Write a protein that binds this ligand. Structure first.
Ligand SMILES: [Ca+2]
Ligand SMILES: [Ca+2]
Ligand SMILES: [Cl-]
Ligand SMILES: [Cl-]
Ligand SMILES: [Cl-]
Ligand SMILES: [Cl-]
Ligand SMILES: [Cl-]
Ligand SMILES: [Cl-]
Ligand SMILES: [Cl-]
Ligand SMILES: [Cl-]
Ligand SMILES: [Cl-]
Ligand SMILES: [Cl-]
Ligand code: NA
Lengths: 343, 343, 343, 345
């Protein structure tokens, strides 16, 4: 099967499988896993931050960041189509007792003036705005790159008000590859960044949160509370090091395959916009087709293509390491045949 | 001072004060205060509900309702400019562990189709939508009346999905006076209603929640936890009975004073919409003025008029029993003079 | 009915009823109720503290104090039979995200060495101990007075660890009338104290939290969140001033009545300990009777005497202004008939 | 390398067999329920405990906390033993995450008197939280790995049934209990709604634990796991090791028991305050009451002579045996304990 559902389905490379077998391990509860310790040291250095914390998931990364940044009844400004709001189970409410303050954005880019206006005045009736979250790349909009200038402007606003800044940088390396902006440079405008090892960088498990020592110390106690305090997790960290240090550059190939796929899908007759394709995601609309997104997902699966429907009329196609250029070509031959059928 | 900040500043009538001194009381924790019991019975009867619960504040009313309607990790659909989101201290997050889902509206009226789209599908990544809140009158937009048809339609959608509906009817008798829709009719389209006694109806303290007996039982236990479990509160209920049964018709005097104020403010040259004024509120914009809202609020204070800024460019003027037509005329002389200064 | 259930059932004096009706009020949200402001100023003065906050209940008192003293995940040391653990609906967990750390005491008095041992070391696994609560008088033991020297030593321990101290002083004036220790001496060894107006001091509604300015400001925003931010609450504070300033001395009568009640009960043959009775409560054991605590409560009620069982073998009798000596003597005649029946 | 580590059974390292299995693991995206190695671990765990459904988690702390969440509403009370791990060593999570209050009940070596549990249940009254969960820990860590009898658990189950209260067993070391008692883990679990057990302690997996229970409960716990951040991707890597832990590493817990008993009996002969009669699984409590140092001073003296151990109070030390401490290591440590006894005695 050709799996275009998500970059989450990436499997470990042979180099990672080997590194996991030979991993040097220890009890991370005591700070004694040498591989964890090295991955964290590396993550911290790559983002120009004092400290780093490995977590079993990006959700946990964001949720411990929120905890470490907030007090009960605080408010978090985030983009209205962001993952923290949509896809993290209302955890910020339950775990941290904080309210989201959604601001609309153009492809993840909140207008700095709208962020300015979402910030609470000091008044008894109002929660305290203590955190602003920015997502790069932006997922719901189709893997779009927030301009560095937006992040720089929003950062400045936050300094003026003493408000912390988090980048949900689940796909920050995809952002860096597309934009040319080094991740240290995005990171410098943030108090904390969460990034995933387990999507396009192909590690089997986990993400990392980078930040200041005192922030990470708090986040590490948050992690213990939430159940992220693992033992000999250096098995996972071994894959994690290879993800971080060796698997970034080739993300360029995911973007090329995605753009190649979109252009060719448009030639066939599918309703796609290749000019919208900036990273590893292609949005496919089904309005011109005889079945909706859900029916077309089934027709694709029967022909050996996996994809998800994100609404009744939209499918998302996501490239990653485990879909090669050949697989893209194979998929296109299938998409051609299914156009003769469902157009 | 001519106090246009809010209708909360209403002081008790002479009859209220007499009834409070003479109040037949008991220990409400044992259900033994007869005057609370009677107020409750009356409020439930007037809204066409099984039961009612006295609370010390409208905020407590809304929050015990949220608690009684929801579980930890649920989502609450509400209007993007509603009081529960803006002026209730992030309590829904702290107290109930729930996420707000702000939907934009037109003067408090959320488009039913947007309410339908805000409902979370059943998926592991998603909170459960268990509550839709509707505010009538809608404060932020200028004490606007939400049309009945809007409330009926949203109620129809909630029924279809098994979602509770709550009305924040802090000023529901104002709505009813302007609209001619009885409060029993509004309430038939909701599972619960909070209404205030301490604003336009002139009681010194508190509000009531009305709904089913099992819901009210849950809300009564919540009230206990939150600290609204009082003792001989029949003192307060005695005024609240007078507020409910004697102070509703004269709200129309407040509507008239507000409209008159608006009409005269427009003729001076201020940025007001007298056609939008149908209850006890006027939104004044500072966009044609030399100072912003906060500068203009200081100037009014300095000449003897109290009002609140609701943004950097908008001021809310609220009428009530303690501002007479003479007071409004006196305030118009002052506004006239400050228009010379700041236009 | 002779009501020995609790001191909560106290009803307002004529003087209080007149003061409520003649109360000078304003909007407490704006800090403009002059009678609330005077009550607060007086409560602060009396406790030798810089600031005070009126609340609708003592439960809200304790809970806003916990909120203002704590962060999510902290731990609060309290006596194992204290009202905060037993009678406040699990609120500290819900509202503040904090764990109770029960320590056994001897009549409310926790052994300081045990308090020392319950303080958590700094360890990722451990919540931070940020608060120690002491209840005086201690209710479940029979209105027992905690020694000043106990509070003094626990205070010293707290200062070594940087831990806050809250006295649940619901009945601190009973303590003070019994011991001769002024409430400002108890409170000089604490950061905050909550005391009740609505129990033995006879106000219809409310309690007060005293403490430092910063702490009270936090407790005031917490109160807003919980729904205790009332409007023209001067009606209640009028009676509150009379309670604080005029109803304290006469608590000695309640104590004399409780003592007479215990001596006479013992002389009839009931299992009471008059040597334990130093305030307004008597614990009576049902061990020499043919019924348990609950069956005796029923027998009593059918003969016109109201009390509460606190276990299967114990009833608590409570004196207050609305059980006079005649009432105690009438009650004793009934208790004598029932001892013939049940002994 | 090259200290004798008696601090805990958490410190166990994977076997060669486990390392090969992880590296070679068949994986998928567990968010989709498509990791076949995870799926098989859960199938096997559920079956081993006589339950419909199982859920892999990254920590026992997560196992417990998703169980509490799945069992409770905000404001509820959880009855548990006063020295239980959920209370002491889980960072206040039950309060923050579930908004519930612990109701501590003192136990006798892990075992709460049934009637004490019954009196801890709240009546229906406005002032009281709802008692919705009773938690039982087996083995009980803090009393020295003590085995809660099956009959205690049976009786508590019966009380709970009568009041409609859920029962969670924190069986972090439930196979240790099972090996000592001869009671199959399915029997312990038959008197419980849910059980959490660790794979990463004495069973030697590098990461994780499992929750077992009914289908509808496990579905609720799976959504809580997603909320807390335990929803992983290609976790079959970890579950490869866990299948080996569950299927090959249970019987040899007998050796850890043998080692702890030997250790305690020999420590008793030397003259240390230990109770060999209390040692039935993999732990020894040693008191410092007849020594010139407290627990902390003794831990440092041990560290200085090549032995790692943890103070559990100012006067007590807990020695824990596990796969990476051999009989020979125990003998070495005893020879040192003997010298140190002369020093501090
Ligand atoms: Ca077509
Ligand atoms: Ca591959
Ligand atoms: Cl190793
Ligand atoms: Cl906090
Ligand atoms: Cl009366
Ligand atoms: Cl209108
Ligand atoms: Cl007045
Ligand atoms: Cl820590
Ligand atoms: Cl005493
Ligand atoms: Cl595979
Ligand atoms: Cl809940
Ligand atoms: Cl045992
Ligand atoms: Na010693």
């Amino acid at each position: 099967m050709i799996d275009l559902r998500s970059d989450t389905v990436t499997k470990p490379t042979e180099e990672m499988r080997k590194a996991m077998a030979q991993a040097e391990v220890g009890d991370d509860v005591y700070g004694e896993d040498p591989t964890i310790n090295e991955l964290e040291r590396l993550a911290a250095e790559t983002f120009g931050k004092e400290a780093a914390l490995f977590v079993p998931s990006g959700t946990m990364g964001n949720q411990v960041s929120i905890m470490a940044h907030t007090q009960r009844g605080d408010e978090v400004i985030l983009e209205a189509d962001s993952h923290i709001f949509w896809y993290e189970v209302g955890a910020m409410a339950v775990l941290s007792g904080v309210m989201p303050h959604p601001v609309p954005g153009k492809n993840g880019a909140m207008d700095p003036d709208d962020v300015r206006k979402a910030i609470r005045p000091r008044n008894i009736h109002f929660p305290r705005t203590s955190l602003i979250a920015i997502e790069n790349t932006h997922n719901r909009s189709g893997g779009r790159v927030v301009p560095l200038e937006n992040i720089k402007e929003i950062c400045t606003i936050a300094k003026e008000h003493g408000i912390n800044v988090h980048i949900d940088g689940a796909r920050i390396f995809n952002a860096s590859i597309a934009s040319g902006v080094p991740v240290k440079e995005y990171a410098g405008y943030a108090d904390s960044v969460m990034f995933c090892l387990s999507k396009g960088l192909c590690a089997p498990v986990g993400s990392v949160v980078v930040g200041d020592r005192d922030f990470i110390e708090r986040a590490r106690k948050a992690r213990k509370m939430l159940g992220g305090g693992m033992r000999q997790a250096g098995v996972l960290a071994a894959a994690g090091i290879i993800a971080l240090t060796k698997m970034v550059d080739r993300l360029k190939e995911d973007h090329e395959n995605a753009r190649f796929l979109a252009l060719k899908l448009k030639e066939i007759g599918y309703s796609v916009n290749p000019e919208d394709v900036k990273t590893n995601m292609v949005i496919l609309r089904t309005d011109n087709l005889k079945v909706n997104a859900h029916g077309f997902i089934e027709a694709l699966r029967n022909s050996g293509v996996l994809a998800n429907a994100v609404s009744d009329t939209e499918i998302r196609l996501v490239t990653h390491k485990d879909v090669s250029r050949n697989d893209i070509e194979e998929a296109l031959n299938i998409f051609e045949k299914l156009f003769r059928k469902f157009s």
